[PDB]
């Protein structure tokens, strides 16, 4: 056999997306360091737009004395922490570049489907930009933690330490999500294989926009945590807007703010959207003024 044939390849996706994916270094001083910077943690980051805003995980840049960003083209920048959000484990970095910057392809009209071929781009173990290939295993995953939803994309594209904050793209090179977490829980002590999670791009975008506009993400906070037709109240926070509304533990809640309350997650999402300081109707009819979510 002779070959004028063309090898099956995802190089096109690689060429479109990889340049925008950067190596992120969290450097910190040590009592050991004696005035010398050392790497606390390392991960990846995605260049969202030509202004030089970069998405990455919050745990990658946490407690950093200095943040270094390295492009694949060789350029190195010191990075400015625009803001972070523990809840989505996201963070925005700013680098200033007079010269042109590569950006990650984004198609906001694109709908990620289960079975879509995807590439994970990142910096595993600081070996240099690695490309691994998998599919979208699932969508709307809550992750390993039972609480907090977060609509994770699940992928079997190989993910390792250093991949955090990196990009997940399809064969077209479009951004699917931000690689964040790898499943490690063991039943019988075995090691989970091909189970990793990414923040969906749509969510990543919204969070980035809010961090660029304000130093933090702002959510309306009732003050009360409860477990689920209706939703009962399991705990009212001490000295809470809650307590100030004088809410009573356990009163079932049928609906809120001109809307029904069957799913708690749907309800909390609604609560988050609402501006802090606003007062709304609740069905158990007691008035309460929301305060912005307590910082974490």
């Amino acid at each position: 056999d002779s070959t004028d044939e063309t090898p099956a390849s995802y190089n096109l996706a690689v060429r479109r997306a990889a340049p925008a994916v950067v190596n992120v270094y969290n450097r910190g001083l040590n009592t050991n360091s004696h005035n010398q910077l050392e790497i606390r943690t390392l991960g990846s980051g995605v260049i969202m737009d030509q202004r030089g805003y970069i998405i990455t995980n919050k745990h990658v840049i946490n407690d950093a004395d200095q943040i270094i960003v390295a492009l694949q083209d060789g350029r190195v920048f010191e990075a400015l922490l625009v803001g972070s959000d523990s809840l989505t484990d996201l963070a925005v970095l700013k680098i200033n570049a007079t010269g042109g910057l590569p950006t990650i392809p984004i198609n906001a009209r694109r709908v990620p489907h289960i079975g879509d071929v995807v590439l994970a781009i990142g910096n595993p173990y600081n070996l240099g930009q690695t490309i691994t290939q998998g599919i979208i295993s699932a969508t709307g995953r809550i992750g390993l933690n039972p609480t907090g939803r977060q609509n994770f994309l699940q992928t079997d594209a190989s993910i390792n330490p250093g991949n955090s904050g990196g990009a997940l793209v399809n064969s077209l090179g479009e951004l699917m999500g931000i690689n964040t977490l790898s499943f490690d829980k063991s039943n019988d002590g075995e090691t989970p294989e091909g189970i990793g999670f990414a923040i969906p791009f749509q969510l990543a975008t919204k969070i980035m926009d809010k961090l660029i506009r304000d130093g933090r993400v702002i959510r309306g906070y009732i003050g009360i945590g409860g477990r689920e037709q209706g939703i009962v109240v399991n705990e009212v926070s001490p000295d809470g807007p809650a307590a100030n509304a004088g809410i009573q533990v356990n009163d079932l809640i049928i609906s809120v703010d001109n809307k029904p309350a069957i799913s708690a997650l749907e309800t909390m999402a609604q609560v988050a959207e609402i501006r802090p300081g606003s007062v709304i109707p609740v069905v158990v009819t007691l008035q309460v003024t929301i305060q912005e979510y307590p910082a974490t």
Binding site: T147, Y221, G225, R227, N234, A264, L265, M268, V271
Partner: peptide, 4 residues
């Protein structure tokens, strides 16, 4: 448990 859900807090909000």
């Amino acid at each position: 448990v859900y807090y909000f």
